[PDB]
Amino acid sequence: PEIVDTCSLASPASVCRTKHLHLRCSVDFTRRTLTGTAALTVQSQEDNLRSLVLDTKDLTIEKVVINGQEVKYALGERQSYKGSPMEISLPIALSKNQEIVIEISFETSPKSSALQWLTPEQTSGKEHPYLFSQCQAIHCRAILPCQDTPSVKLTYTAEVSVPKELVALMSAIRDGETPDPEDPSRKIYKFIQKVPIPCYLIALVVGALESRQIGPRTLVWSEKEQVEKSAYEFSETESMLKIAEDLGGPYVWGQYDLLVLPPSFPYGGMENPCLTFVTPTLLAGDKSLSNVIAHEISHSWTGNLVTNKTWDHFWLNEGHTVYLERHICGRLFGEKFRHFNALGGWGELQNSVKTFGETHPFTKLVVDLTDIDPDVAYSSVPYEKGFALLFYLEQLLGGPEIFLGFLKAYVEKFSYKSITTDDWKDFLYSYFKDKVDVLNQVDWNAWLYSPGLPPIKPNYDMTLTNACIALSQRWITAKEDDLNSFNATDLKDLSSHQLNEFLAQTLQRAPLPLGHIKRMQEVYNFNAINNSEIRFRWLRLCIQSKWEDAIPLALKMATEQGRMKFTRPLFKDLAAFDKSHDQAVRTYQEHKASMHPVTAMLVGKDLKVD
Ligand SMILES: CC(C)C[C@H](NC(=O)[C@@H](O)[C@H](N)Cc1ccccc1)C(=O)O
Ligand SMILES: [Yb+3]
Ligand SMILES: [Yb+3]
Ligand SMILES: [Yb+3]
Ligand SMILES: [Zn+2]
C-alpha cells in the first residue's frame, strides 16, 4: 500500500523519518547567503539502514558529520525543479526505530528559489536590507538538506545570527535574543518549534521589523511604515482565532503572530506556524480583505495539524481550509455572507476550468504531479473544487452543524499526521456510518478524478449576489441607449465585496465595448479604488477591453507589487493586448533581476520569454 511523493528525491517515510532539526545559521546579506549547520535527527524504519537520501537544490555542502566524525556523501545530478539528491553514508547500519543524528555544513545559493534577498532600496525604509523565505511547496530543499516531503513531520530548534540592527523571526516560538560572540556585528536569535511540522512550513524573515500587539497571542510585524496600518487592518484576528477553536478544537501552536511582508511576497498569505506571512496588498484600510487572515488561521488545523501526505492530495489542505475560512466569515458577518463567498468561489472555479480547459488534468481534484512542477500546476482548483465538494456534502448530510462535527472529529483523528484522500474518505464513511446510504449517492469518481466542473453544483443563497448580477448583466447587455442612465447611484448599496463580485462577473464576459468601459470609469471612478482585488479585476477588464489608457496602470500594479495572483494575469493580459505587448515584455525583462525567484520564473514562462 505504498504512496509516493513524486516531488521529492529523498528517502521516503517508509525508510526513515526525520524527527527533529537543530538549525544554527547566519544570515550574510553581503554575500546573500545563509550559512550553517543542519543537525537532523533521523529515525530508521528499516533494519540495516546504511545510507539515506536527502533533497537539496542549489546547495553548497561543506561537510557531513556524524558522531563527531565526517562521513561519505554524494550529490547526484540535478533533476530540474526537484534540485539534486544528496546521498549520505551511515557509519553504522540502523535498525527499525533507531536514530542517528546527521549534522550538515551548508551554504545556500544567492539564487535560492526559497528566498528573496532585497536591497535596502527595495524596502520601505530604504536603509536596510531584508530577507524572506517561502518553502511551500518544495523549496525547503533550497535552504537546507531534508526529506522535502509533507509526509514527514519534525520538530525543530534554531538559532540564527543576524546583524545587530535587524530582527529575525521564524515559524516558531521566539525563545530568546542574545548578542553573538564571534568577531561579529550580529545578534543571535532563538526559536523553538515543539509541534511536529512538514518542512514546507519552515520559515524565516530578517529585516528592520517592528511589531504591534493586537491580541493576547498576537503581535503584528512589519517595517515601521506598515505597522500602524497593519495593526488596524488585522484587528479581528483574535476573534477569528476564537471561532476557529470552536470549529476545529484547541489552537495548539501557542502564538499566532502576523508578518506583513514587502510587496514582492508572492502569496496573499502563508500559514507558517506561529507566524503567518501576508501580502501588504491586504492593507485595504477597511479590513475587507480579512478573509485571508481567517484562511491562514484555519490552516492551524487543516494543513498544519492534518497535512496532505503528498502534493497530489493538496486539496485536503486547501479545500478544508476554504471551508473553515468561510465558516469563520459566516460567523462574523452572516450566513448570507458565507453563501455569497461560496458562490463567488464557484465563479473562480469556472474561470480556472475555462482557463486550463475542461479536459485538463490539472482540473481534477486529486492530481498526479509526476514530472510536473508544483508552482506550475498551481491553481484555484484544489481550493474551489475542494470547497465545493465539502459544501455539497454538508448539504447532503444534514447541514453545517452536522458537517462541522465530522470536521472537528477528522481533525482530532488525524492530528500530527500526514494523510491521503482515501484516509479522509474512509474516515468520512466511518464517521457517517449511519448515513452510508447517503454517501453512496455521491459520484466519488467524478468528484475526485474527473476533470472539469464538478458533477453537481451545491445550492446557494442569492441574497447578496443578486445586486451583482443585475448590475453586471445590465452592463454586459447595454446598448448605446443605456449608457447615459448608468450612474454612481448604481453603487449605493454595494459593499466592497459586491463591487468586486460585480467586476468578476463582468470580467467573465470580457471584452466589453471600449466605449462601455470608458463610461464605466466615468460613472463609477474605479480608477480611484485602492482595494487590490477590485483594482486587479478592474484593470484586467480595461486591458481586455482594449483601453490603452489602462496600460500604464496595469504595468504599475503588476510591478509595484508581486502577489502572483495579480502579477501573472496582469502581465499576461498586457502581453495579449497588441498595444502593450512589447512594453509588457520589456518591463518584465527590466524587472526580472529584482523580482521574487518563483514569480520571475513563472512570468517568463507566461510571457514565453527565454
Ligand atoms: C485563498 C486565500 C485565503 C489565500 C491564498 N493563500 C493560501 O491558500 C495559503 O494558505 C497557501 N498555503 C499558499 C501556497 C500554496 C501553494 C504553494 C505555496 C503557497 C492566496 O491567494 O495567497
Ligand atoms: Yb566557500
Ligand atoms: Yb561562501
Ligand atoms: Yb435599448
Ligand atoms: Zn491555504
The one catalytic residue among 130, 383, 410, 524: 383
Contact (Cβ atoms closer than 8 angstroms) between residue 540 and residue 510: yes
Distance 351 CA to ligand 1 centre (A): 18
Domain with CATH 1.10.390.10 in the chain: 305-461
Domain with CATH 3.30.2010.30 in the chain: 208-304
Residues facing 192 on adjacent strands: 157, 173
What distance in Å separates the CA atoms of residue 512 and residue 506, rounded to the nearest whole number?
Answer: 8
Region of 452 please: left (phi>0), alpha (psi -120 to 50) or beta. left
299 is in an annotated binding site: yes
266 is in an annotated binding site: yes
Region of 23 please: left (phi>0), alpha (psi -120 to 50) or beta. beta
What distance in Å separates the CA atoms of residue 484 and residue 17, rounded to the nearest whole number?
Answer: 68
Distance 61 CA to ligand 2 centre (A): 9
Q: What percent helix, strand, coil does the chain show, rounded to 5?
A: 45, 25, 35
Strand order in the sheet with 99-108: 69-70, 59-66, 99-108, 33-44, 16-28, 154-163, 186-197, 173-179
271 is in an annotated binding site: yes
**Which residue has a Cα nearest atom 3 of ligand 1?**
292
What distance in Å separates the CA atoms of residue 67 and residue 528, rounded to the nearest whole number?
Answer: 64
**What CATH code would you report for 15-207?**
2.60.40.1730
Residues in the 5 Å CB sphere of ion ligand 5? 321
SS3 label, residue 563:
coil
**Which residue has a Cα nearest atom 6 of ligand 1?**
269
Q: Pick the closest to residue 64 from 79, 77, 75, 78 (CA basis).
A: 75
Distance 487 CA to ligand 4 centre (A): 16
Q: How many residues does the chain have?
A: 610
For the question of residue 383 being annotated catalytic, the response is yes
Contact (Cβ atoms closer than 8 angstroms) between residue 133 and residue 118: no
Q: What stretch of H or E contains 583?
A: helix 581-591
Method by which the coordinates were obtained: X-ray
Query: Half-sphere exposure (CA, 13 Å, Cβ side) for 43?
Result: 12
361 is in an annotated binding site: no
Q: Which amino acid is at 104?
A: I
Distance 579 CA to ligand 1 centre (A): 33
**Lookup result for grid cell 518563483:** 598
SS3 label, residue 222:
strand
269 is in an annotated binding site: yes
Contact (Cβ atoms closer than 8 angstroms) between residue 365 and residue 381: yes
Contact (Cβ atoms closer than 8 angstroms) between residue 165 and residue 189: no
Residues lining ligand 1, Cβ inside 6 A: 136-137, 267-271, 291-292, 295-296, 299, 318, 378, 383, 565
Distance 474 CA to ligand 4 centre (A): 11
Question: Per CATH, which fold does 305-461 belong to?
Answer: Neutral Protease; domain 2 (1.10.390)
What distance in Å separates the CA atoms of residue 27 and residue 23, rounded to the nearest whole number?
Answer: 12
What distance in Å separates the CA atoms of residue 348 and residue 385, rounded to the nearest whole number?
Answer: 10
Q: What is the dihedral of CA 524, 526, 527, 529, to 10 degrees?
A: 120
The one catalytic residue among 296, 394, 501, 533: 296
What distance in Å separates the CA atoms of residue 321 and residue 584, rounded to the nearest whole number?
Answer: 35
DSSP sequence for 126-154: SSS-EEEE--TTTTGGGTS-B--STT--E
**Which residue has a Cα nearest atom 11 of ligand 1?**
270
What distance in Å separates the CA atoms of residue 548 and residue 518, rounded to the nearest whole number?
Answer: 11
**Which residue has a Cα nearest atom 22 of ligand 1?**
268
What distance in Å separates the CA atoms of residue 147 and residue 153, rounded to the nearest whole number?
Answer: 10
Cell of 39: 543537525
Q: Pick the closest to residue 534 from 278, 259, 285 (CA basis).
A: 285
**Which residue has a Cα nearest atom 13 of ligand 1?**
270
The closest ligand to the CA of 278 turns out to be 1
SS3 label, residue 532:
helix
Distance 105 CA to ligand 2 centre (A): 11
The closest ligand to the CA of 477 turns out to be 4
Cα torsion angle, 6, 7, 9, 13, sign: negative
Helices marked H in 184-236: 224-233
Q: What secondary structure letter does DSSP report for 528?
A: G
**Which residue has a Cα nearest atom 18 of ligand 1?**
136
Ligand 1 test: best mutation among 270, 282, 561, most atoms within 8 Å of CB? Answer: 270
Q: What secondary structure letter does DSSP report for 67?
A: T
Query: Half-sphere exposure (CA, 13 Å, Cβ side) for 256?
Result: 26
SS3 label, residue 443:
coil
State which CATH number among 3.30.2010.30, 3.40.50.720, 3.20.20.370, 3.20.20.70 fits the domain covering 208-304: 3.30.2010.30
Its CATH class, for the domain covering 462-610, is mainly alpha
Q: How far apart are the first and last CA of the chain?
A: 42
Q: What is the stated resolution of the deposited model, in angstroms?
A: 2.0
Domain with CATH 1.25.40.320 in the chain: 462-610
The closest ligand to the CA of 113 turns out to be 1
120 is in an annotated binding site: no
Measured CA angle at 382 (ends 380, 387), to 5 deg: 95
Domain with CATH 2.60.40.1730 in the chain: 15-207
Q: Pick the closest to residue 411 from 283, 560, 244 (CA basis).
A: 244
Q: What secondary structure letter does DSSP report for 302?
A: B
Ligand 1 test: best mutation among 258, 259, 276, 295, most atoms within 8 Å of CB? Answer: 295
